[PDB]
Amino acid sequence: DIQMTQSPSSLSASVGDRVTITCRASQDVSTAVAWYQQKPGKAPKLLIYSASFLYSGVPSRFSGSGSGTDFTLTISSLQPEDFATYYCQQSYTTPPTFGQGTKVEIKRTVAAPSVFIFPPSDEQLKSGTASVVCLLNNFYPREAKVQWKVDNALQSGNSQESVTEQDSKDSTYSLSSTLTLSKADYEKHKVYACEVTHQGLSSPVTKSFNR
């Protein structure tokens, strides 16, 4: 089974940048290599076939090169709508195999997150469980550190984070941290604090409330 390894696995680049992705096959595959583009919640789109040929309707700024084991995709001038995951694929033998994918991220200037803390609803409490939500809105880069202080105590393995896909307009991320406890355990504590560490912040920001 022919293995396809892409390089790098992920990258950050700005609009107008020349970007190149490489693909290396575990054995010679002639020029029988294709490149695909994939956007969240959508099927892959053929970009290049036969290593170097532009698929009908794909814009001239996509190009491909290579043969044998080493292959290359180039985007001469990166457009907004070019952030996706790119995949090479070997077509020389059955079964066809894909590379692991290269996530092309959009590089921009550091932006600080607006922090918001949301208490459990009086409606949720009536079910015996309590969810406390901490929001990090519109920030960059992705890397962040959210800390849950509960009556001045750190927490471990009882909160969960989710991160938004890169934004359409301003290319920022957004993050939710959700702290989950029981009602009887939520009731017996007072200060609920969400501590946020981020590069765009001058000093770690705590957003809290009083029970």
């Binding site: 892959p44 036969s50 939500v133």
Partner: protein, 218 residues
């Protein structure tokens, strides 16, 4: 008008069975290979099975061999993946794609995908709880908790509000149920002067909740 349209994904128990279909329009399936390629949540693209032009031959990945059958019904111009003895690790989005060794010998037309989720958990619709704004410009939202399986749709003020909305990727809780939250930032002058309803949909459980998000008591 060439296209590949799939259906048949859903929830099955481990050891259960499912059949995915792949309807071709504007070309004859039997003129092409059909491949099924799958994408486990967050992972890459794994080829699963292939059937040859005219139904001459059939190939399977080792992870799937002896459990899955690929074929087609030509009178229906539709290809199939019959999935038996399903396991947790078969949970993925499943794509069909056409292919031939004639140019461009690449996968030019694809189906949209269907979610196959393999679990011993029952279908469960979410509870929807408001995230009431604390205390410039402020934030509010909806917590969509404890549902199975994926996916969930969220929209605000019946679609008349989009700017500044972030619906988060669901997170699998250690209870086995999914949870997510959808959030929006608003002008603090237009809150308490404009009503905010989030519109949660959970098709798998036929659950549709609309929620009025308003400020708290104290």
């Amino acid at each position: 008008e060439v296209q590949l349209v799939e259906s048949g994904g859903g929830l099955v128990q481990p050891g259960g069975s499912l059949r995915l279909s792949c309807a071709a329009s504007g070309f004859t399936i039997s003129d092409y290979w059909i491949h099924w390629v799958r994408q486990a949540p967050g992972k890459g693209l794994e080829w699963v099975a292939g059937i040859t032009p005219a139904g001459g031959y059939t190939y399977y990945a080792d992870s799937v061999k002896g459990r899955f059958t690929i074929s087609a019904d030509t009178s229906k111009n539709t290809a199939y993946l019959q999935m038996n003895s399903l396991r947790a690790e078969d949970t993925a989005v499943y794509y069909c794609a056409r292919f031939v060794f004639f140019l461009p010998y690449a996968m030019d037309y694809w189906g949209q995908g269907t979610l196959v989720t393999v679990s011993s958990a029952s279908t469960k619709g979410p509870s929807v709880f408001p995230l009431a704004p604390s205390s410039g410009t402020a934030a509010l939202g909806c917590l969509v908790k404890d549902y199975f399986p994926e996916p969930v749709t969220v929209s605000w003020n019946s679609g008349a509000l989009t700017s500044g909305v972030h619906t988060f990727p669901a997170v699998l809780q250690s209870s086995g149920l999914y949870s997510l939250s959808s959030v929006v930032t608003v002008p603090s002058s237009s809150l308490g002067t404009q009503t905010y309803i989030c519109n949660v949909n959970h098709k798998p459980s036929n659950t549709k909740v609309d929620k009025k998000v308003e400020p708290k008591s104290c």
